[PDB]
Amino acid sequence: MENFQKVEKIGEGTYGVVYKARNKLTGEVVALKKIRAIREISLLKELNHPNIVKLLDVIHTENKLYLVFEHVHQDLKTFMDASALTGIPLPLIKSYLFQLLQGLAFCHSHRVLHRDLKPQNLLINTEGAIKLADFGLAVTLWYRAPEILLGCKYYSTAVDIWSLGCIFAEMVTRRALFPGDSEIDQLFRIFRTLGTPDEVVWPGVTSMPDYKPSFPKWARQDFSKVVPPLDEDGRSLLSQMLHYDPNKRISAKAALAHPFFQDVTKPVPHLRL
Numbered sequence: 001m002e003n004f005q006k007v008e009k010i011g012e013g014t015y016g017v018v019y020k021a022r023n024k025l026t027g028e029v030v031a032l033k034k035i036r037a038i039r040e041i042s043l044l045k046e047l048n049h050p051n052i053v054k055l056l057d058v059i060h061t062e063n064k065l066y067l068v069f070e071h072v073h074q075d076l077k078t079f080m081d082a083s084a085l086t087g088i089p090l091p092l093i094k095s096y097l098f099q100l101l102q103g104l105a106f107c108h109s110h111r112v113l114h115r116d117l118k119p120q121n122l123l124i125n126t127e128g129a130i131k132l133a134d135f136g137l138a139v140t141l142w143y144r145a146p147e148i149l150l151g152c153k154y155y156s157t158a159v160d161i162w163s164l165g166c167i168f169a170e171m172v173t174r175r176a177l178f179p180g181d182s183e184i185d186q187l188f189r190i191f192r193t194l195g196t197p198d199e200v201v202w203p204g205v206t207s208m209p210d211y212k213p214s215f216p217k218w219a220r221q222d223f224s225k226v227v228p229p230l231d232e233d234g235r236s237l238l239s240q241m242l243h244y245d246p247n248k249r250i251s252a253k254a255a256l257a258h259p260f261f262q263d264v265t266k267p268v269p270h271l272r273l
């Protein structure tokens with residue numbers, strides 16, 4: 001719209017492109033997302049929390065839709081790329097995970113799923129906060145829960161916990177946990193690490209629409225091999241976020257009281273700009 005001046009492309013989102021823009025009327029720098037609903041989006045406008053990027057305005061004009069969000073200094077993927085030589089320090093990984101769980105517990109209690117969590121849409125500021133973006137709107141497959149890969153259409157909030165498990169693991173080891181390049185390769189990288197699932201660990205799995213009896217049968221690896229050198233409290237919380245069965249996967253509210261968070265603090269990151 002004519003009230004905005006775009007400075008540059010910030011990035012592509014699930015349902016559209018995002019630009020950094022300045023709003024002439026306010027002089028504020030903003031993140032402007034041009035889409036490709038009205039009601040489902042206006043609801044999101046009222047979803048405010050410290051760990052959720054704020055939806056400022058919705059502009060439905062000339063049969064077009066633009067969502068105006070607060071602009072956040074940097075994204076987590078850029079931050080992880082910049083720290084891959086020394087790795088993000090643990091006190092910071094723990095702070096970020098804890099704040100992420102708070103925003104997810106808040107969205108989840110309002111029945112709002114994220115569905116596409118990834119480092120690119122996790123936003124961090126100079127003060128140590130982190131925020132969920134590209135939310136409640138509803139291609140990298142790396143953070144996709146197995147139930148989506150197996151063609152389940154009525155998935156739950158547990159899909160977000162799984163994606164968050166994957167990110168947590170990546171922040172610790174500085175390597176993507178399951179970097180698949182197609183849906184079947186994605187499923188197989190998961191099975192190769194966590195074991196091919198069966199009716200014992202995941203009741204109803206052989207009944208998923210895309211489940212095939214011909215899937216190879218792989219043994220599960222130990223998590224101590226998967227996430228060195230995460231401590232035992234961290235590994236145990238992680239194994240609970242990565243349970244195959246969505247009904248057994250830990251919820252965000254429950255994970256907030258896990259012993260891994262006993263010593264959380266909110267350190268300030270060292271970020272370049």
Ligand SMILES: O=C(Nc1cc([C@@H]2CCCN2)[nH]n1)Nc1cccc2c1[C@@H]1CCCN1C2=O
Pocket residue numbers: 010011012013014018031033053069070071072073074075078120121123133134135
């Ligand atoms: O506020 C920001 N800040 C930034 C900054 C950056 C960049 C990307 C390269 C360097 N840092 N991405 N996002 N981003 C932002 C704000 C509101 C909504 C969204 C986003 C991101 C961009 C990708 C999809 N996202 C959204 O749906």
